[PDB]
Design a protein around this motif. Structure first.
Motif, PDB file in Angstrom:
ATOM      1  N   UNK A 148       0.871  -1.169   0.000  1.00  0.00           N
ATOM      2  CA  UNK A 148       0.000   0.000   0.000  1.00  0.00           C
ATOM      3  C   UNK A 148       0.902   1.211   0.000  1.00  0.00           C
ATOM      4  N   UNK A 149       0.340   2.351  -0.341  1.00  0.00           N
ATOM      5  CA  UNK A 149       1.021   3.588  -0.045  1.00  0.00           C
ATOM      6  C   UNK A 149       1.216   3.676   1.461  1.00  0.00           C
ATOM      7  N   UNK A 150       0.307   3.065   2.209  1.00  0.00           N
ATOM      8  CA  UNK A 150       0.342   3.170   3.659  1.00  0.00           C
ATOM      9  C   UNK A 150       1.451   2.307   4.241  1.00  0.00           C
ATOM     10  N   UNK A 151       1.795   1.245   3.526  1.00  0.00           N
ATOM     11  CA  UNK A 151       2.863   0.358   3.954  1.00  0.00           C
ATOM     12  C   UNK A 151       4.218   0.959   3.638  1.00  0.00           C
ATOM     13  N   UNK A 152       4.370   1.370   2.381  1.00  0.00           N
ATOM     14  CA  UNK A 152       5.515   2.162   1.967  1.00  0.00           C
ATOM     15  C   UNK A 152       5.698   3.250   3.028  1.00  0.00           C
ATOM     16  N   UNK A 153       4.633   4.007   3.311  1.00  0.00           N
ATOM     17  CA  UNK A 153       4.711   5.107   4.271  1.00  0.00           C
ATOM     18  C   UNK A 153       5.139   4.578   5.631  1.00  0.00           C
TER      19      UNK A 153
END
Ligand SMILES: Nc1ncnc2c1ncn2[C@@H]1O[C@H](COP(=O)(O)OP(=O)(O)OP(=O)(O)O)[C@@H](O)[C@H]1O
Length: 201
Positions: A148-153
């Protein structure tokens, strides 16, 4: 001996591409990380020490090191990052010094870890730190980790604080446009390294 520039980068900053560009200018690039894989080949001493220290979890079934697992361990556990760096550093140093002796370019580029112990790399003339914007890193991590973008983040929230390394670097290559601007900056750095190598002893 040889004028050497240490290349560092934060995650997904583009530093490999930066190395390729310096290479294309005829600059010998020494990769500490490749040396490290070499010296942790099956039944090297370091390989045996890593496995005995971390145990069977870091050994894949085919007998190679679980390098991904070892990274996860090392990025989350600073004591282990240090144990590992201190295990490999002597053998890495020697392999680097050999390549420096037979270095055929006006200066050398040495890709080293973001949080390198200067005391293990006292011979550097310059440190180059490559960095990329959060967005860029995120786009990059998502294409490479498929997350996710949230995981990357989340992956980036864990990234080490750069501000001390930033202060230390002699140059900071902000990789924030395209490959083309990246190349142009590497040429400018290259011309800077040639000029200083020429006039410094
Ligand atoms: N400024 C840019 N614009 C567009 N694409 C880029 C840019 N910089 C790098 N890339 C591309 O991003 C990809 C990532 O390569 P890169 O050099 O980032 O590895 P890296 O950041 O050194 O990897 P690591 O995460 O181990 O540091 C390559 O396909 C490269 O061409």
């Amino acid at each position: 001996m040889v004028y050497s520039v240490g290349l560092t980068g934060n995650i997904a900053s583009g530093k490999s591409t930066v190395a390729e560009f310096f290479s294309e200018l005829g600059i010998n690039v020494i990769y500490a990380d490749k040396i490290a894989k070499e010296l942790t080949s099956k039944n090297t001493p370091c390989y045996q020490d890593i496995i005995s220290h971390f145990g069977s979890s870091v050994v894949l079934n085919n007998g190679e090191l679980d390098r991904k697992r070892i990274r996860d361990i090392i990025f989350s556990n600073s004591n282990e990052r240090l144990w590992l760096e201190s295990l490999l550093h002597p053998v890495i140093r020697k392999k680097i010094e050999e390549q420096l002796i037979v270095c055929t370019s006006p200066y050398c580029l040495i890709e080293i870890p973001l949080l390198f112990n200067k005391h293990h790399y006292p011979y550097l003339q310059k440190v180059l730190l490559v960095i990329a914007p959060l967005e860029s890193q995120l786009d990059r991590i998502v294409k490479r980790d498929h997350c996710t973008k949230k995981q990357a983040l989340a992956i980036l929230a864990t990234q080490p604080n750069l501000e001390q390394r930033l202060e230390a670097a002699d140059d900071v290559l902000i990789n924030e446009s395209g490959l083309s601007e990246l190349k142009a900056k590497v040429n400018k750095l290259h011309q800077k390294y040639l000029r200083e190598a020429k006039i410094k002893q």
